[PDB]
Design a protein. Structure first.
Lengths: 261, 131
């Protein structure tokens, strides 16, 4: 099946871009700027805009973080990509901010966030997805609850936007944002590559190598001056591969009254 | 109103006047300082405490402390609205007797706070593991 692809870290930080290699476009007759339909796990769905990029391999697809959380998939998994040319201009859009992102704004969100982000963008959206808007000092997420036609539509100047109502409370399987990922680490490319080399395999697929039989690593020492961000590296790795990061502090084990340490 | 005198500080309160309430003391007026002393108004406002005028020779340091402390204490709501990390600790180090406790007390009294003092030796000598 020469349609599926494995997700990978991207460079373009826009919410509606994907990076495919030119042989993939030649094989699938993919142009630039078309609308493609992306299928993933949990029967989730989203749409995006194809952009050219030669850095990624042919079998590899580059995509940002917001779409990755939209599809409920982690890096290293498989998604299905196809051209989706039946999409047409939307009519009305109903958006509602999330509860734990707008604590203390109380202003016209339409003129502040939505108007610049949706300006001359032609961003296609699908009902039920979440997208993040940069702003003044914080980041605000909006979950599109209604669009016409459903489920697909394209932003046009003469579209109705409603930005009024009680903000929707957080979901459960939403994979809450603001958790540190791989974009929050800079200037540590080589060491992060070394760490990812020996930890990805025993954490993503746990049974295969054990069946083969090898000695997986059982301890990694991160040493350096304080403030360089080692806890950040550990938390990012844990939150990306998928694990149960359980920090135990140093002094907290020493402050206990002897016996119970 | 507080009047300076012989050796202490004496503060007086007016209970009534004519015409009321506004008036200007004139050379031709009748005063009476006869009567039992009244008690505190019960809203504190004690002028015998410390302020910014009781510290001298530390203008730059007081300016720095005011710069880095006034906003988190006076306006908490706006600060938590902006969403930026506030300072969590300040060290004052110097020779003993230069008046660090005075600076802390002055800031706490003037900006409005709940100054709570923790001694070192008092905590240290509290017996067993109850410290
Ligand atoms: N790319 C980065 N590299 C190093 N430090 C970072 C980076 N991004 C953020 N930080 C800072 O590192 C801090 C967390 O590091 P910290 O847990 O204190 O490491 P350590 O505890 O080992 O000193 C964060 O407050 C953040 O401001
Ligand atoms: N403007 C001033 N600058 C420094 N010290 C002062 C000033 N005014 C008064 N003092 C004296 O400094 C003393 C501070 O005592 P103390 O709390 O022991 O200082 P520290 O704790 O800094 O050693 C007060 O008893 C006060 O008499």
């Amino acid at each position: 099946r020469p349609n599926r692809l494995i997700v990978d870290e991207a460079i373009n930080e826009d919410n509606s871009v994907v990076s495919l290699s030119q042989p993939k476009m030649d094989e699938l007759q993919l142009f630039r700027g078309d609308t493609v339909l992306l299928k993933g796990k949990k029967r989730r769905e989203a749409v995006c805009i194809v952009l050219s990029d030669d850095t990624c391999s042919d079998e590899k697809i580059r995509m940002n973080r917001v779409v990755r959380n939209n599809l409920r998939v982690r890096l290293g998994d498989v998604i299905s990509i196809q051209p989706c040319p039946d999409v047409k201009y939307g009519k009305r859009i109903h958006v509602l901010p999330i509860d734990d992102t707008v604590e203390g704004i109380t202003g016209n969100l339409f003129e502040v966030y939505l108007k610049p982000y949706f300006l001359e963008a032609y961003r296609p959206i699908r009902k039920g997805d979440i997208f993040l808007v940069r702003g003044g000092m914080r980041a605000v997420e909006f979950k599109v609850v209604e669009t016409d036609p459903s489920p697909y539509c394209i932003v046009a100047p003469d579209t109705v936007i409603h930005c009024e109502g009680e903000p929707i409370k957080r979901e459960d399987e939403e994979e809450s944002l603001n958790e540190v990922g791989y974009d929050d680490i800079g200037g540590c490319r080589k060491q992060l590559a070394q760490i990812k080399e020996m930890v990805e395999l025993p954490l993503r697929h746990p049974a295969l190598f054990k069946a083969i039989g090898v000695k997986p690593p059982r301890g990694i020492l991160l040493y350096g001056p304080p403030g360089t961000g080692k806890t950040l590296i550990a938390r990012a790795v844990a939150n990306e591969t998928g694990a149960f990061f359980f920090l135990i502090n140093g002094p907290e084990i020493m402050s206990k009254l002897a016996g119970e340490s």
